[PDB]
Amino acid sequence: QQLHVVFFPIMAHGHMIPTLDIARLFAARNVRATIITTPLNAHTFTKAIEMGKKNGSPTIHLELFKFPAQDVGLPEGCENLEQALGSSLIEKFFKGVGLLREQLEAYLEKTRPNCLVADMFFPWATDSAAKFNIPRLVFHGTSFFSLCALEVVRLYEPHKNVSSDEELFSLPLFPHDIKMMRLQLPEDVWKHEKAEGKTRLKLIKESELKSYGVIVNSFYELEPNYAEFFRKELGRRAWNIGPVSLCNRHECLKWLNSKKKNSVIYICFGSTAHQIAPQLYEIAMALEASGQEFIWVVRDSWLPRGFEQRVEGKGLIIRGWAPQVLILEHEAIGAFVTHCGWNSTLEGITAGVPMVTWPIFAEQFYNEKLVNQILKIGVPVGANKWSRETSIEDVIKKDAIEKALREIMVGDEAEERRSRAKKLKEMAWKAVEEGGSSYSDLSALIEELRGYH
Amino acid sequence: QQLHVVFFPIMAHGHMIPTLDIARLFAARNVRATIITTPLNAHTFTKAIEMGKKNGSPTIHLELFKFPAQDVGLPEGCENLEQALGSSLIEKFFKGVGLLREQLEAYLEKTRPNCLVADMFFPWATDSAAKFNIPRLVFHGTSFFSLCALEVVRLYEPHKNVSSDEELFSLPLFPHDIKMMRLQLPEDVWKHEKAEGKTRLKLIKESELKSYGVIVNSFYELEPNYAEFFRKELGRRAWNIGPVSLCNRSHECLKWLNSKKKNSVIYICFGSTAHQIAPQLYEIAMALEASGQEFIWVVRDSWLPRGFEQRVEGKGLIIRGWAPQVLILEHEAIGAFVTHCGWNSTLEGITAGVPMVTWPIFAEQFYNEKLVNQILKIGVPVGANKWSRETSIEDVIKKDAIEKALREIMVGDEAEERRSRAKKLKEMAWKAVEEGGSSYSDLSALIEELRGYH
Ligand SMILES: [Br-]
Ligand SMILES: [Br-]
Ligand SMILES: [Br-]
Ligand SMILES: [Br-]
Ligand code: NA
């Protein structure tokens, strides 16, 4: 009789889409998959389900919970983490999602599924599932490297034994030597201790040991030392089942067919990225000065006069939606400028494209270390300040940007980075195919859920 | 209304007695303490409560659960782990205690206490307490060293890279170099893989991270490297509150001892739990006589040499049954303690400042023996190296091995140094449990933390 797994992502585009992909991976092994969402977020899933269904692909069920926006003083329209801009709104959003516990517990009591896969941001989901002897898995949607780095920083606080903003400290027990500065950490953790953010991270990392285990959107062969470190040194039970976006598997593409292999730079910072006019201006000048052909995705005081005319042969600006995967996988694309969010980083890896890394917040400075120092498939733009706000002082200048654009295309080790990225691409596809490490760990997890008593 | 803590020990004398002592330590901080037991075990608590009460001491409540003996095919009389001898009986005993879950959940629903202190052998008690938003503490009744050693052996399997019974391997991450052989580990783990015992240990060790934390019957200053290792390297939240047997603490054998030189007499006591076969007792008797050492031997007549008691009349005393163990160990005349090196026994040797001849048999005892001999350096091994819940005639320790250990603990090269080291641990143990001590302090901190839990 059919195994039932319930998936409960936080309402953030970057968590919802990989959660859907995991639900789809489970559905393809004949597991009943239900995703919990809210009314204003349902369209994201309904569209994406049908736009990957009608091929005999199994059915993903949606369950809708009421988000108590009014109750916590959020606008009725604010059912997504992206809409909660400002310190006030974010704190209210987290109180809001915390009040979904009553609905989760009623749903589990009613449906009695075999497993709950709950977002990292719901540490309390473990106790909710335990009430009905249901195992809970934690899903973060980041790298093993980041999960390990964050935890060694939290436990060993290497940044308390420094005396300046830019003083380098090593990550303590790691099998690679990784240096960071305080600038690269959120200001709550290092400068003015704020129990809210600090208590939230503590409960998230503790959930990894208190729960049945951790599903990870990565492949063993990508970061073997950290897949092991997470399980051995840090004691987590984990399954690596990614890259989960490989599960199922236009004018700009015609434009690219005309171009030399590895000749074009793709720049796309995602939907999370909040780009100010002065920053866009420095990118525009750097692109022109670099001489490099480019496809630049933007979400006009911020364009140099005559930009659009000067770059007619060489540069394409797309306002809004780009077919990102089809662009990255085009032979003409030789590099990817990214914020180093894990979804973007994994798409660069899967396309075999070297990356210019532009970390901003969250786990991105850890992802940047993986890409540049361990995988050696990237070049840093030189952003070293962790910030969820964009101060004019933190804008990266034309000269830093131009240096990185040139290095990733024609720098001495640019070809070596391309060769290394092409190897990871082959290893990624091999992980997800029958017999691969990710296919295998998914089989092992399901078998283990089937036998749980 | 006062904080209420429920204590749920497994029905083993070695877990019940320390659990009572913890309940008493909690009761003295004005915490309501209830102990869960079964009808045939209640006498152990009733006696021990009243034999330490009538002084206005705060009241420990008992709750009785029915043990489903018939249900798992055990004799009605088998409500204690000591009665479950043989592979068949032990497995049934563990199925039995597992079926107490229904009664635990009904009791917690009814009483709604602030915290459940549940035996290591009840990993499911964490989820049972969580149903009513009650924090669960794990209690094992052993050393930090044993908790760390078992876990490093389970995770890193140093014994899998071996080819023979007696080949020595090091314990992996420890700041001391500790060498063991497969013989010293249970035969399920190393020889013939049995998922039952292996799954049981896995769920016990996992409960240490899944639960609110771990109460430990040890003191920080006794094993500082392992008190830290358990919390840092292994990530457990833990409180060290022992030796818990000091809580209550502010005839003819004692008259017999007053006649004797300081540190001249060996005390031998394996406990009432101890199952000793006639051939083994016989080898001990011969070793004691041959050693020339004065002795007090506590035994729980085919196994005595003819004329033994008469030949040793000046030098040796055999006590049949109850001995005033504390008063004997604390007598100036007692220079050594022959023990099985279970943690309760090991801690009483430490608290009396008496060096120990270590005779490990099963459970965590070979790890405790490494702590005593290699780290504390207050003991000498008898040379038992075989982990066994059964005593086969083939595994008996012979007179010559026993005599060698009796001589070594009394007059061997480092005998004086072992006595000096043990006397330091004695002072540190009493300092830990007095107001301002590490164990007094961690107990205050735990209670404060339980008081502020939401
Ligand atoms: Br690696
Ligand atoms: Br870097
Ligand atoms: Br130590
Ligand atoms: Br030894
Ligand atoms: Na660890």
**B155 chain-A contacts, CB cut-off 8 A:** 232, 235
Amino acid letter, residue B323: A
User: Could you state, in order of their start, the residue ranges of all structural domains in chain A?
Assistant: 4-247+429-451, 250-428
CB B65 within 8 A of CB B103: yes
Determine which of A101, A105, A131 to mutate to test the interface with B (most B C-beta atoms within 10 Å): A131
CA B309 to chain centre: 31
Using CA atoms of A427, A430, A432, A434 in order, give the dihedral in degrees to the nearest 10.
-160
Mutate to test the interface with A, among B101, B109, B131, B454 (most CBs of A within 10 A): B131
Query: What residues of chain A lie within 8 A of the CB of B210, using their CB?
Result: 209-210
Ligand 3 center–CA A354 separation, angstroms: 50
The answer for residues whose C-beta is within 8 angstroms of residue B35's C-beta and 6 or more apart is B6, B7, B8, B9, B19, B20, B23, B45, B60, B61, B62, B63
> What is d(CA B349, CA B373) in angstroms, rounded to the nearest whole number?
13
> What does the angle CA B111 – CA B117 – CA B122 come to, to the nearest 5 degrees?
100
Name the residue in chain B with its Cα closest to that of A237.
B206
Torsion, CA A43, CA A44, CA A50, CA A51, rounded to 10: 130
In chain B, which residues have their Cβ closer than 8 Å to the Cβ of A155?
232
Among A42, A35, A40, A36, smallest CA distance to A60 is for A35
Give CA–CA dist B201/B82, Å, rounded: 19
What CA–CA distance (Å, rounded) separates A420 from A375? 8
Question: Is B218 within 8 Å of B242 (Cβ atoms)?
Answer: yes
Distance separating the N- and C-terminal Cα atoms of chain A: 16
Q: Enumerate residues 6+ apart whose C-beta is below 8 A from B203.
A: B123
Residues of chain A that touch chain B, judged by Cβ-Cβ distance less than 8 Å: 127, 130-131, 133, 155, 209-210, 232, 234-235
Type of residue found at B427: E
**∠ Cα B67 B72 B77 (to 5°):** 50
Amino acid symbol at A93: F
Ligand 4 geometric centre to CA of A341 (Å): 53
- Within 8 A by CB and 6+ apart from A43, the residues are none
Q: How far does the centroid of ligand 2 lie from the alpha carbon of residue A158, in Å?
A: 19
In Å, how far from its chain's centre is CA A433? 22
Reading the block at residue A245, the tokens are: 């976006």
One-letter amino acid for residue B383 of the chain: G
CA distances from B307 to A356, A372, B286 (A): 92, 83, 12
- CA dist A424 and A336 (Å) reads 15
Q: How many CB atoms lie within 10 A of CB A312?
A: 8
In sequence order, what are the beta bridge partners of A180?
A169
Cα(A133) to centroid of ligand 2, in Å? 44
Strand partners, A5: A33, A115
Q: Which structure tokens are listed for A161?
A: 């034994």
Distance CA A223, CA A373 (A): 12
Cis upstream peptide for A243 (omega within 30°): yes
Element (H, E) at B32: strand B32-37
A231 C-alpha to ligand 5 centroid (Å)? 9
Least CB–CB distance from A131: residue in B131, B232, B234: B131
The residue assigned the tokens 């991450």 is: B173
- Contacts of residue A195, defined as CB under 8 A and 6 or more positions apart, other chains included, come to none
Reference B390, options B145, B88, B161, B29; nearest CA is B88
- Give chain A's radius of gyration (CA, Å): 22
**Closest alpha carbon to B173 in B233, B220, B232:** B233
- How far apart CA B280 and CA B286 sit, in angstroms, is 10
Contact between residue B381 and residue B406 where contact means Cβ atoms under 8 Å apart: no
Pick from B418, B397, B410: nearest CA to B287? B397
Q: Compute the radius of gyration of chain B from its Cα atoms.
A: 22
Q: Which of A219, A154, A124, A182 is nearest to A428 (CA)?
A: A219
Annotate chain A with three-state secondary structure: CCCEEEEECCCCHHHHHHHHHHHHHHHCCCCEEEEEECCCCHHHHHHHHHCCCCCCCCCEEEEECCCCHHHHCCCCCCCCHHHCCCHHHHHHHHHHHHCCHHHHHHHHHHHCCCEEEEECCCCCHHHHHHCCCCCEEEECCCCHHHHHHHHHHHHHCHHHHCCCCCCCEECCCCCCCCEECHHHCCHHHHCCCCHHHHHHHHHHHHHHHHCCEEEECCCHHHCHHHHHHHHCCCCCCEEECCCHHHCCCCHHHHHHHCCCCCCEEEECCCCCCCCCHHHHHHHHHHHHHHCCEEEEEECCCCCCCCHHHHCCCCEEEEECCCCHHHHHCCCCEEEEEECCCHHHHHHHHHHCCCEEECCCCCCHHHHHHHHHHHCCCEEECCCCCCCCCCCHHHCCCHHHHHHHHHHHHHCCCHHHHHHHHHHHHHHHHHHHCCCCHHHHHHHHHHHHHHCCC
For residue A429, the distance in angstroms to the closest alpha carbon of chain B comes to: 31
Looking at residue B398, the DSSP 8-state letter turns out to be P
Q: What whole-number distance in Å separates Cα of residue A341 and Cα of residue A362? A: 8
**CA separation, residue B397 to residues B282, B345, B387 (Å):** 10, 20, 13
Q: Could you tell me whether strands B213-216 and B136-139 are parallel, antiparallel, or unpaired per DSSP bridges?
A: parallel
Complete DSSP assignment for B257-298: HHTS-TT-EEEE---SS----HHHHHHHHHHHHHH--EEEEE
CA B216, CA B235: separation in Å to the nearest integer?
Answer: 15
Residues of B with Cβ-Cβ distance to A133 under 8 angstroms:
127
According to CATH, the topology of domain B251-429 is Rossmann fold (3.40.50)
Q: Looking at CA atoms only, how far is residue A210 from chain B in angstroms?
A: 4
Q: Which two tokens stand for residue B174?
A: 């420890």
Q: What CATH number is given for B4-247+430-452 in this structure?
A: 3.40.50.2000
Contact A295, A327 (CB under 8 A): yes
- Data resolution in angstroms: 2.4
On whether the CB atoms of residues A108 and A128 are closer than 8 A, the answer is: yes
Is B140 annotated in the active site? no
What architecture does CATH give domain A250-428? 3-Layer(aba) Sandwich (3.40)
What is the edge-to-edge ordering of all strands in the sheet holding B316-320? B316-320, B294-299, B265-268, B334-339, B356-358, B379-381
B114 vs B130: CA distance, rounded Å = 11
Return d(Cα B117, Cα B137) in angstroms, integer.
5
Tell me which residue of B143, B84, B45, B89 sits closest to B275, measured CA to CA.
B84
Q: What one-character DSSP code corresponds to residue B140?
A: -
Torsion (CA) A371, A375, A379, A380 in degrees, nearest 10: 30
* HEC readout, B400-448: HHHHHHHHHHHHCCCHHHHHHHHHHHHHHHHHHHCCCCHHHHHHHHHHH
Same fold, B4-247+430-452 and B251-429: yes
DSSP 8-state symbol, B371: I
* Total Cβ atoms within 10 A of residue A256: 20
Q: How far apart are CA A313 and CA A304, in angstroms?
A: 17
Q: Are B344 and B351 in contact (CB under 8 A)?
A: no
Of A23, A209, A9, A31, which Cα lies nearest the Cα of A126?
A: A209
HSE-CB of B292 using CA atoms within 13 angstroms? 4
Q: Which residue in B4, B21, B119, B442 is the catalytic one?
A: B119
CA atoms within a 13 Å half-sphere pointing along the CA-CB vector of B30: 4
Where do we find the tokens 């236009």? A250
Amino acid identity of B268?
I
CB distance A428 to A222 below 8 Å: yes
CA-CA distance, B129 to B71, in Å (whole number)?
Answer: 25
The DSSP secondary-structure symbol of B184 reads: G
Ligand 5 centre to CA of B235 (Å) is: 6
Give the span between the Cα atoms of B301 and B305, in whole angstroms. 9
Residue B149's CB is within 10 A of a number of other CB atoms, namely 25
Report residue B263 as tokens: 């540190």
Q: Residue B361: name the closest of B275, B285, B296, B234 by CA.
A: B275
Residues whose CB is less than 8 angstroms from the CB of residue B43 and which lie 6 or more positions away in sequence, other chains included: none
Q: Distance (Å, rounded) from C-alpha B443 to C-alpha B432?
A: 11
Measured between its terminal Cα atoms, the distance across chain B in Å is: 16
**How many of the other CB atoms lie within 10 Å of CB of A271?**
11
Could you tell me which residues are beta bridge partners of residue B298? B319
Helical (H) or strand (E) element with B370: helix B365-370
From the number of C-beta atoms within 10 Å of its C-beta (0-12, 13-18, 19+), residue A262 rates as middle
- Does residue B9 sit in helix, strand or coil? coil
> What is the DSSP annotation of B49-108?
HHTT-SSSPPPEEEEEPPP-HHHHT--TT--SGGG--SHHHHHHHHHHHHTTHHHHHHHH
Q: In what order do the strands lie in the sheet with A378-380?
A: A315-319, A293-298, A264-267, A333-338, A355-357, A378-380
Can you tell me the distance from the alpha carbon of B178 to that of B367, in angstroms, rounded to the nearest whole number? 9
Best probe of the A interface among B101, B109, B127, by most A CBs < 10 A, is B127
Are A353 and A421 contacting, i.e. CB atoms less than 8 angstroms apart?
A: yes
Structural contact between residues A21 and A244, judged by C-beta atoms closer than 8 angstroms: yes
* Among candidate residues A384, A378, A382, the one with its CA nearest the CA of residue A407: A378
Encoded tokens for B27? 């009761």
CA B369 to chain centre: 12
Q: Residue B130 and residue A130: Cβ atoms within 8 Å?
A: yes
Collapsed DSSP state (helix, strand, coil) of residue B367:
helix
Q: What is the distance between the alpha carbons of residues B326 and A151, in angstroms, rounded to a whole number? A: 47
Method: X-ray
Q: Which amino acid is at A277?
A: A
Question: Which tokens sit at B275?
Answer: 């199952």
Contact A133 B155 (CB under 8 A): no
Question: For tokens 């006069």, what's the residue?
Answer: A305
List C-alpha distances in Å: B24 to A194, B51, B262, B426: 39, 13, 34, 22
Cα separation, A411 vs B41, whole angstroms? 79
From A127, A130, A209, residue closest to B209, measured CB to CB: A209
Distance CA B315, CA A217 (A): 73
Residues of A in contact with B127 (CB under 8 A): 130, 133
Q: List Cβ neighbours of B376 (8 Å cut-off, separation of 6 or more).
A: B222, B350, B421, B422, B425
- CATH architecture of structural domain A4-247+429-451: 3-Layer(aba) Sandwich (3.40)
Cβ neighbours of residue B137 closer than 8 Å, sequence gap 6 or more: B115, B116, B117, B118, B211, B212, B213, B214, B215
Q: How far is Cα A125 from Cα B61, in angstroms, rounded to an integer?
A: 35
B234 to A235: CB separation less than 8 angstroms, yes or no:
yes
